[PDB]
Structures are given as C-alpha cells and as structure tokens.
C-alpha cells in the first residue's frame, strides 16, 4: 500500500450537498407557486461527475512510504 | 501584511459593511490615499555637496529602468 488517499463516502457527501441546496429548492417551489408540502416524493437529481489527473505534484520529505508525484482528483457536481 | 489582494479586500469590505454594520474597515480609495506617504518621492532631503551627475529633484517615483534608450531600430534593441 504505497498510496495516501482520502475520501468522503458517496452517500454522505451527497446528502450534505443536497441538504445545503435546500434554500434554493424551497425558493424554486415558492416562485413556481407549487405547493410546498404536497407532491414531495418524486424529485430527481441529475449529477455530473468528473475524474482527472494532475502532473508534477512535488513530494514531501516526511516519514513514509514512498509515493509517486502525480495526483488524481475525483469530484462531482 | 496578510497577503490580501485589493479585490479580495473590497469583497470583505462590502461583506462586513452590508451585513450588520457599522462598517469597520475603510474603503479602497482612502487606503490608496494613505499610500503616497510611504512610497519614496514624498519627503524632502538635501545632498551636501551636490551629487555628481544626479538630478536634484526629490519627487521622482517609479522610473523606467531603460533610462532613455533611443529605441530606433538600427541600434541595439
């Protein structure tokens, strides 16, 4: 295991990014003049995901273990 | 002394003033007015005896280093 990596679990990061946008979905329900309480079971969220690498990320002295320099960054929106 | 860009500082200024202010920081154009005292070319001085082949005007700010190159094409560029 020569890899140092970190990640949020998918479901948890998704429910936090969706619970953050709650202001805008409520305001859209208001402007659209649709009832807030009713018909709340059929939502649909379309999510763009992206993955990319990045060259020459300089290494640190540190303790261990040895790691390559290139990094990979998986993100979504 | 905190590496705050001018535009980031104006962003912070608008933010702290608009919400619950009572602004504390000063606007940009009054910071820029307290500047001309720190840069060179503001205080008077006198060299005794007069300096050799150096102008005696004491208000020169940032000068271009080329120092009067005769840009004409035929010479060194």
């Amino acid at each position: 295991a020569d890899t140092i990596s970190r990640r949020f679990r998918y479901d948890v990061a998704l429910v936090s990014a969706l619970k953050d946008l709650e202001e805008d979905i409520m305001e859209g329900l208001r402007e659209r003049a649709l009832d807030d309480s009713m018909c709340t079971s059929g939502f649909t969220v379309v999510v763009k995901e992206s993955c990319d690498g990045m060259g020459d990320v300089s290494e640190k002295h540190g303790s261990g273990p040895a790691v390559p320099e290139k990094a990979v960054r998986f993100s979504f929106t | 002394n905190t590496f705050l860009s001018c535009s980031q500082y104006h962003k912070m200024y608008r933010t702290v003033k608009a919400t619950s202010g009572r602004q504390i920081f000063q606007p940009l154009h009054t910071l820029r007015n307290a500047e001309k005292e720190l840069l060179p070319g503001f205080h008077q001085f006198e060299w005794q005896p007069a300096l050799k082949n150096v102008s005696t005007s004491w208000d020169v700010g940032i000068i271009d280093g080329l120092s009067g190159w005769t840009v004409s094409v035929d010479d060194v560029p």
Partner: protein, 75 residues
C-alpha cells in the same frame, strides 16, 4: 484525427440526445485543479499524513453554497 471525426459526425446526435453539450464539459473539473495548488501551500498542514485530509476539508468548505450566499452581501 479523432476529434475531427467526432466534431463532424456525432455532434447533431449528442446535442439532440443530451439536450446540450459543453454544459457537461470537463472545464468544471480542470478549473478546480487550480484550487488544489493554492490549498497545498496556504491552507494545508505541512505533513505527508494530514495533508490530503485538510485539503479535502478546506475545498469542501470553499465549494459550499451556504457561505457563498453570505458572501453575495445582497449586491
């Protein structure tokens, strides 16, 4: 070249199917890479162990909408 084949053959099909193209472009990821460098000099603890953890956290705090609403300052 491959991109010439894609831009001369499969453009109408994907614009009709997805509805749009370029709104799903990779530009939205690459730009973020810029952050990854500023967040590795300014705001990341200088240790091999905690570096990824603190970069991930500071990036997720910069990307949230809830603090951007405050930062809009209502014009």
């Amino acid at each position: 070249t491959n991109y010439l084949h894609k831009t001369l053959a499969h453009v109408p099909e994907i614009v009709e199917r997805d509805g749009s193209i370029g709104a799903w472009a990779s530009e939205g990821n690459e730009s973020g890479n810029k952050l990854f460098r500023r967040f590795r000099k300014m705001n990341a603890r200088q240790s091999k162990t905690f570096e990824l953890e603190d970069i991930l956290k500071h990036h997720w705090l910069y990307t949230s909408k809830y603090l951007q609403k405050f930062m809009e300052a209502h014009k």
